[PDB]
Amino acid sequence: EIVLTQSPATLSLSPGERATLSCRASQSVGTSIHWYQQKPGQAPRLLIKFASESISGIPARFSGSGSGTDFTLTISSLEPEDFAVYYCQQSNKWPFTFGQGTKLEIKRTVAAPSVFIFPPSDEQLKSGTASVVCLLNNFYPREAKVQWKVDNALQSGNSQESVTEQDSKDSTYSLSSTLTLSKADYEKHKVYACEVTHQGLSSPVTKSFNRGEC
Amino acid sequence: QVQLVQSGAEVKKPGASVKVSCKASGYPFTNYFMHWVRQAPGQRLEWIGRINPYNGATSYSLNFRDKATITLDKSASTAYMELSSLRSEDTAVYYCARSTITSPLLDFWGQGTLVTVSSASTKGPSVFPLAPSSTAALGCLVKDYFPEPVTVSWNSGALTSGVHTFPAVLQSSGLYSLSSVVTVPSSSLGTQTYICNVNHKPSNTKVDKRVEPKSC
Amino acid sequence: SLVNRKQLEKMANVRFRVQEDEYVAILDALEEYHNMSENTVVEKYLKLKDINSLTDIYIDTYKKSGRNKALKKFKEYLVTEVLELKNNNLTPVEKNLHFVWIGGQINDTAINYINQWKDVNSDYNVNVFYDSNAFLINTLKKTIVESATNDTLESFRENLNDPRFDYNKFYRKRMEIIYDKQKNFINYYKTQREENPDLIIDDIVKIYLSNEYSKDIDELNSYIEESLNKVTENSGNDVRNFEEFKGGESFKLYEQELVERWNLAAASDILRISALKEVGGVYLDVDMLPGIQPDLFESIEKPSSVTVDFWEMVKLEAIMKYKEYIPGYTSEHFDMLDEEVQSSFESVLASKSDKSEIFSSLGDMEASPLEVKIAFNSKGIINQGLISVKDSYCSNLIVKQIENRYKILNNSLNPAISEDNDFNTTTNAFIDSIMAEANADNGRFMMELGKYLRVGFFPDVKTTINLSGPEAYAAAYQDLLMFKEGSMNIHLIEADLRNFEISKTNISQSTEQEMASLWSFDDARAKA
């Protein structure tokens, strides 16, 4: 089995900068390396075949080079449409393998998130469980820490997160963490807090409420 | 021109089997090998195997040598892809791609087909509010539904700037759940008129429930 | 063009010498040769033959003559003229691909190879020659050799598990049994033909196997029906419908190897050339593939120390690995190349999408009415590939060579088999007969016949090469270039035989089925 290790996993660059993606092979594959581009929701598209040969309909800014174990994909000037995932496969030995890929992300300035917390619905409150949502709206970079606190006691294992793809207009992200718990557990603790830490925040933001009222 | 049209999304329980199709048109079908590739959610591409026209010569990957079986209907210029002992970890997208040679030089791909493997049964999504206010943000919570996907949209798309329909999360119960949020400046010409016209095809569900600041 | 009469007169002019009758005969023949501008190619050669005959006469009559040097040089001019007459007067080749599979069911491998020629030569008519009367010769030969093996193992059963019973002593003791079982079938066959001439070979074989070896006829009839159906679907051509071949004096030689000797290979050597003579076209062994496009791998330089067969096998192994025209093909040799050089082959084949870009087509070929082109390898000529127009002169010489060579064989073999003696006495009586008739000019040919009875049942026996194989083609070529017939001692060098070479662009010879079917006879196993 030929393992192909691509590096870096994530690459943050701005349009007009030079992108250089690596693909390492556990043993020599000659020059039988191909590169594929995949945007979310679409099928892969072939960029370079056999390390360096050009493909029809692929702009010139994409080029490839390599031989043996080390192979490079270079994008001279990044266009906005070039930010996506890039995979390398070897074709010289069976079984044929792909790399894990390289996600090419647009790099922008640090944007702090807008933290919002939402209590459960009356419809859901009576229908078994209860959902508490915490929204982190339009922020960058992608890394963020959400922590649920109940009566000053943290929580874990009873929450799940979800992150959007990088926005097309402002290049920001958004995270929604949901604290799922039964109506019983919900009706035996007072304060429900969401603590958000992020590079754009001077200190962790803590949006919270008490058992839904005003 | 050249097209690879694949079967529709499939949903089977563990143990069952499924056959995905891949009809090729626009080029001499007998000149290109038909390859198959898997892609589990958030993982790398995995070569499943290949079949060539003019003969049933097939070559599979080591991992799929037992689970997959590739056949073709040369008369119709299609390729079939059968999976047997379906496991939950087989949930993925399945692409068919053409290649001029044995080894995978996949120059043209298909749209892919999503095969979902789980014990859960078809169920429609239950929507719940998400509309506090004290700029302010409000949304919905499309919870508990199976299988994927759902098409959440806001008021048919009048004001869509700022919408964020998060990807679905898979719960321990086997059902999916997501949320859809919006950012609005509260005090403006949009006091109300905010609905979540959610849609779910596998279950035939199209609920547009409206919600707004809670009552005190 | 050839030197004219006046030039040859000035060439051999010797003052104070009489104009000999044998000399004027040469000048008369040459002068009238240069007036045959309208005759056929063959007639032009038959004239140069006489000119050479007369020149040989003069030189032998006047050994100390001062004209000899000029006439010995004039002889060389005649050979040059034949080759120019060959390479300048060309007629279209009958677009026919001739394959042969006789004595058994056609193999799936052979059909696959054949289809590769069809796909790139839709203008060529294919003929897979089979014998509708003899589909059981293979099973018969296998039934007797297998039974002869067990009988040899019954004896020596005490010492087969230990040394002192090498593969040399095993094949010897087994052959004397095969000869008795083989001699017995021929007697039954010969007696069944005079008693019931309406029977075919398959009728005699399937009843012979049902009595002496307990074979099921219902299974044999279904094997014939299956073998006939399979070959008729693939451009099958029945030899029993080949009237010209079946009436000529070379058909008994075909049935001699088919029925008596079970040497299907030898029967094919006899059949292929007669077909090429009567119809014309191209003969090809079933393990030959079309030529590769010359400009396909032009950019991948061949290594320095490897052989041509290596590189040709690499090219085919690469084509089959990545295009899979023949699935399951080997890669023993492609796997010996650097990973980067492998990528070069892979790359070029990735830029090709159609087979016409890989394999070339024979197309419009043309050859001389005198010549028969033959394939070449590192060992010399080989009759696995042949190109000839209808009724070419060499094809007739080749047929005459084989017919004449079997007479010398059967002239010493028949008086030895007519006596109901064992294998050892027959062999010794057969070898004593060849050395008596052996004259100091056909020695090498007679030295290869002493093994005739052991062909097909022994390792490293190459008597077919001398009877109907390439050796008879080399002699035919010598007959042409020497203006004679009945050559037995080959003195042609490689340069001479290259005038009849098939271009490497028209045949891919180093295939897997060919490099696996050849001789590899250190396979002393001993069974279990």
Q: What is the domain-level CATH number for residue C304?
A: 1.10.10.1780
User: How distant is the Cα of B176 from the closest Cα of chain A, in angstroms?
Assistant: 12
Residues C268 and C302 in one domain: no
- Give which of C168, C432, A121, C389 is closest to B140, Cα–Cα: A121
Give the CA angle between residues B167, B169, B172 to the nearest 5°.
170
Q: Are A126 and A32 in contact (CB under 8 A)?
A: no
Chain A neighbors (3+ CB pairs < 8 Å): B, C
Indicate the length of chain A as a whole number: 214
- B69 vs B88: CA distance, rounded Å: 18
C-beta separation of A22 from A9 below 8 A: no
Name the residue type at position A6: Q
Residues forming beta bridges with residue C237, ordered by sequence position = C129
Instruction: For chain C, list residues whose CB is within 8 angstroms of any CB belonging to chain B.
Output: 321-324, 327, 346, 349-354
Which of C308, C309, C328 has its CA nearest to residue C320?
A: C328
Nearest CB among C321, C327, C353 relative to B100 is that of C353
- Return the axis-axis angle of helices C167-195 and C201-212, rounded to nearest 10°: 120
Domain count, chain C: 3
SS3 of C257-318: the string is: HHHHCCCHHHHHHHHHHHHHHHCCEEEECCCCECCECCCCCCCCCCCCCCCHHHHHHHHHHH
Does A103 touch chain B if contact means CB atoms closer than 8 Å? no
> In Å, how far is A76's CA from the nearest CA of chain C?
25
Sign of the dihedral defined by the CA atoms of residues C416, C421, C427, C431, in that order? negative
Please check whether residues C465 and C355 belong to one and the same domain: no
Domains within chain A, CATH numbers bracketed:
1-108 (2.60.40.10), 109-214 (2.60.40.10)
The domain boundary residue, chosen from C40, C60, C89:
C89
Q: Does A153 contact B at CB distance below 8 Å?
A: no
Sequence-separated (6 or more) residues with CB below 8 Å from residue C152: C170, C173, C174, C177
What would the two tokens of residue A6 be? 């691509």
SS3 track for chain B: CCEEEECCCEEECCCCCEEECEEEECCCHHHCEEEEEEECCCCCEEEEEEECCCCCCEEECCCCCCCEEEEEECCCCEEEEEECCCCHHHCEEEEEEEECCCCCCCCEECCCEEEEECCCCCECCEEECCCCCCCEEEEEEEEEEECCCECCCCCCCCCCCCCEECCCEECCCCCEEEEEEEEECCCCCCCCCCEEECCECCCCECCEEECCCCCC
C123 in contact with chain A, both atoms CB, cutoff 8 A = no
Q: Among partner residues A32, A67, A68, which is closest to C346 by beta-carbon distance?
A: A32
Measured CA to CA, the distance from residue A31 to residue A68 in angstroms comes to 6
**Tokens 């159906």 label which residue?**
C229
Q: A133 to chain B: nearest residue by CA?
A: B130
d(CA C103, CA C264): 7
Residue C366 touches partner A, C-beta closer than 8 Å = no
The residues, ordered by sequence, that sit 6+ positions from C269 with a Cβ below 8 Å of its Cβ are C383, C402, C464, C467, C468, C469
CA distances from B63 to A95, B90, C239, C288 (A): 9, 12, 52, 37
Instruction: List beta partners, residue B136.
Output: B184
Tell me how crowded residue C418 is: count the other CB atoms within 10 A of its CB. Answer: 9
Residue partners of C449: CB distance under 8 A and separation at least 6: C408, C409, C412, C434, C463, C466, C467
Q: For residue B169, which residues of chain A lie inside 8 Å, CB to CB?
A: 160-162, 178
Let me know: does C58 contact C20? Beta carbons within 8 Å. Answer: yes
Question: Which helix (H) or strand (E) element contains residue C227?
Answer: helix C217-232
Tokens of B118: 């789980």
β-pairing, A145-150 vs C96-100, is unpaired
Q: Do C343 and A32 touch (CB under 8 A)?
A: yes
Backbone angles phi, psi at A186, to 5 degrees: -65, -35
C85 & C160 share domain: no
Residue C159 in contact with partner chain A when CB distance is under 8 A: no
Give the residue from chain A lying closest to C340, CA to CA: A30
- B84 with B18: CB under 8 angstroms? no
Sign of the alpha-carbon torsion through C205, C211, C215, C216? positive
Q: Provide the residue type at C399 as one letter.
A: V
What's the sign of the alpha-carbon dihedral C408, C411, C414, C417?
Answer: negative
Rounded Cα–Cα distance for residues C389 and C392 (Å): 6
Task: Spell out which residues of chain A touch residue B137, defining contact as CB-CB under 8 Å.
Answer: 114, 116, 135, 137
- B61 closest CB neighbour out of A34, A95, A118: A95
Which string of b and e fits A131-140 if b means at least 16 CB within 10 Å?
A: bbbbbbbbbb
CA–CA distance, C522 with C520 (Å, rounded to integer): 6
Which pair of structure tokens corresponds to residue C303? Answer: 């290594």
Q: Does residue C298 sit in the same domain as residue C239?
A: no
The 3-state DSSP class for residue C211 equals helix
Domain assignments of chain B as residue spans, ordered by start: 1-115, 116-216
CB C448 within 8 A of CB C463: yes
Residue with tokens 């035989």: C497
Same domain, C205 and C300: no
Interface test with B, best of C352, C353, C357 (most B CBs within 10 A): C353
Query: In terms of CA atoms, which chain B residue is nearest residue C354?
Result: B31
Structure-token pair, residue C68? 């000899």
Q: Is A84 on the interface with B (CB under 8 A)?
A: no
Domain identity same for C234 and C376: yes
Contact C120, C359 (CB under 8 A): yes
Task: Report the residue from A87, A133, A180 with minimal CB separation from B130.
Answer: A133
The first and second tokens of residue A166, run together, are: 């990088």
Q: Is B55 in Cβ contact with C327 (below 8 Å)?
A: yes
H or E stretch covering A194? strand A191-197
Tokens 């016209």, residue? B197
Q: What's C82's domain CATH number?
A: 1.20.58.1190
Search chain C and give the residue with CA nearest B29: C353
Q: Which residue has the tokens 């593969």?
A: C167
Last residue of a domain, which of C311, C344, C360?
C360
Q: Just give the CATH number of B116-216.
A: 2.60.40.10
Environment class of residue A79 by beta-carbon count within 10 Å: exposed (0-12), middle (13-18) or buried (19+)? exposed
Residue C508 near residue C312, CB atoms below 8 Å: yes
Query: Which amino acid is present at C234?
Result: N
Residues C484 and C434 placed together within one structural domain of the fold: yes
Tokens of B198: 């959610």
C-beta of residue C253 within 8 angstroms of C-beta of residue C280: no
- In chain C, breaks (C-N over 2.5 A) are found after none
| Alpha carbons A130 and A181: distance in angstroms, whole number | 6
Same domain, C197 and C224: yes
Cβ-based neighbour number of residue A126 at 10 Å? 10
- What distances in angstroms separate CA B202 from CA A151, B8, B154, C43, C438, one per listed residue? 41, 12, 21, 88, 94
Residues 68-107 of C with CB under 8 A from A: none
Residue of A nearest to B182 (CA): A137
Amino acid (one-letter) located at A179? L
- Per-residue exposure over B45-64, b if at least 16 CB sit within 10 Å of its own CB, e if not: bbbbbbbbbeeeebbbbeeb
Which residues form the domain of C303? 292-360
Instruction: Please tell me the distance from the alpha carbon of residue A63 to that of residue A53, in angstroms, as a whole number.
Output: 8
Which SS3 state, helix, strand or coil, does residue C33 take?
helix
